[PDB]
From a paper:
Recently, we demonstrated that cmo5U modification requires the previously unknown metabolite carboxy-S-adenosine-L-methionine (Cx-SAM), which is generated by the CmoA-catalyzed conversion of prephenate and SAM to yield Cx-SAM and phenylpyruvate.
Difference Fourier syntheses calculated after initial rounds of refinement, without the inclusion of ligand, exhibited features consistent with the binding of Cx-SAM in the catalytic site. The side chain of Glu-182 (96% conservation) forms polar interactions with N6 of the adenine moiety and the side chain of Asp-152 (∼97% conserved in [name] orthologs, and highly conserved in all members for SAM-dependent methyltransferase superfamily) interacts with the 2′- and 3′-hydroxyls. In all subunits in both Cx-SAM bound structures, a feature modeled as a phosphate ion is present between two basic residues, Arg-202 and His-208 (98.3 and 67.1% conservation, respectively), with one of the presumed sulfate ions from the crystallization media present at a similar position in the apo structure.
Author numbering: 1 to 323
The structure:
């Protein structure tokens, strides 16, 4: 069982301290709920990895760690084998002492779409909602953030993040908590909040936006990214049982529509920063994710479309300020 003492101890002494009124209880419950099918294999992976202080660390242009002298083939195999047990690796990539984890997504491409539109991350305390493996949190550190907190109620992604953290010298500037966004009170304590790929999984989209607002300090920045379709303010798709084979997909608004929803929920200075079709170069099967992926979710004879007939995945980035 993973110990969140470090995190509690950290926030006890800073401006997130009020989170202790709820968090440890929620984490404890989550820890009892847990017997995942494969939980042992995942947590053994983390336990049996070596703690290594990177000699060189790049978080600015990637997430890459190197040692002073190359590791032995056996040291490298031990790492690779153990990381290979945390498959499927979806968000990345990571390059760790020569072990190159090529993840389903080019999460770097998203980061590059986003960065040019952000307020300076330098010194900020940040929340990443549905952070996955935690890739982006490391980039946020790389880009100057003081503290990066992620939440994702998936167990595998917690083990992934802690595996990476161990190999980055047990770095204490990022943390992943296994909560859902629904579980948080109104912390009003983060300078910048990210929600990327989460809105379309929420039954109530406006309440998601209000819940994100509730986590920001005044003058804070929201970074919102999700599936969209083309059209005006009033154009919004709600698909059936499956969209691109995903099961519980609710609102896929246009960017213009989503801009309006943000105004509804009381944000200002709202900008549509980037709109982009997801290509099978951004999302695809790799040696580190070997089940189905985007190519399988598209219409075989028309990539303009999903396998079900809907317009194909298309993603938008919006930035806003909380007044
Ligand atoms: N209730 C929830 N609260 C917080 N997270 C959730 C919740 N439910 C599911 N998620 C998580 O949201 C992530 C979905 S991906 C975005 C990853 C990254 N942010 C990216 O921008 O690529 C989808 C995509 O790639 O479009 C997964 O990690 C889910 O476990």
């Amino acid at each position: 069982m993973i110990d969140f003492g470090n995190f509690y101890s950290l926030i006890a002494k800073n401006h997130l301290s009020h989170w202790l009124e709820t968090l440890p209880a929620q984490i404890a419950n989550w820890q009892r709920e847990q017997q995942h099918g494969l939980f042992k294999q995942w947590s053994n992976a983390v336990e049996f990895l070596p703690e290594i202080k990177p000699y060189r660390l790049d978080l600015l242009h990637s997430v890459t760690a190197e040692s002073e002298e190359p590791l032995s083939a056996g040291q490298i195999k031990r790492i690779e084998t153990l990381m290979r047990n945390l498959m499927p690796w979806r968000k990345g990539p990571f390059s760790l002492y020569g072990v190159n984890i090529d993840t389903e997504w080019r999460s770097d491409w998203k980061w590059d779409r986003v960065l040019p539109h952000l307020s300076d991350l330098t010194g900020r305390t940040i929340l990443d909602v549905g952070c996955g493996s935690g890739y982006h949190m490391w980039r946020m550190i790389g880009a100057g953030a003081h503290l990066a907190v992620g939440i994702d109620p998936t167990q595998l992604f917690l083990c992934q993040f802690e595996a990476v953290r161990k190999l980055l010298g047990n770095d204490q500037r990022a943390h992943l908590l296994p909560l859902g966004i629904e579980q948080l009170p109104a912390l009003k304590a983060f300078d910048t909040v990210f929600s990327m790929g989460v809105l379309y999984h929420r039954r109530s989209p406006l309440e998601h936006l209000w819940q994100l607002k509730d986590q920001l300090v005044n003058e804070g920045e929201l970074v919102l990214e999700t599936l969209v379709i083309d059209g005006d303010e009033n154009t919004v798709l709600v698909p059936g049982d499956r969209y691109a084979q995903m099961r519980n997909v609710y609102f896929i608004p246009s960017a213009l529509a989503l801009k309006n929803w943000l105004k509804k929920c009381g944000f200002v200075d709202i900008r549509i920063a980037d709109v982009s079709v997801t290509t099978t170069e951004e999302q695809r099967r790799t040696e580190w994710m070997v089940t189905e992926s985007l190519a399988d979710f598209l219409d075989p004879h028309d990539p303009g479309k999903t396998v079900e007939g809907y317009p194909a995945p298309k993603r938008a980035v919006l930035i806003a300020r909380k007044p």
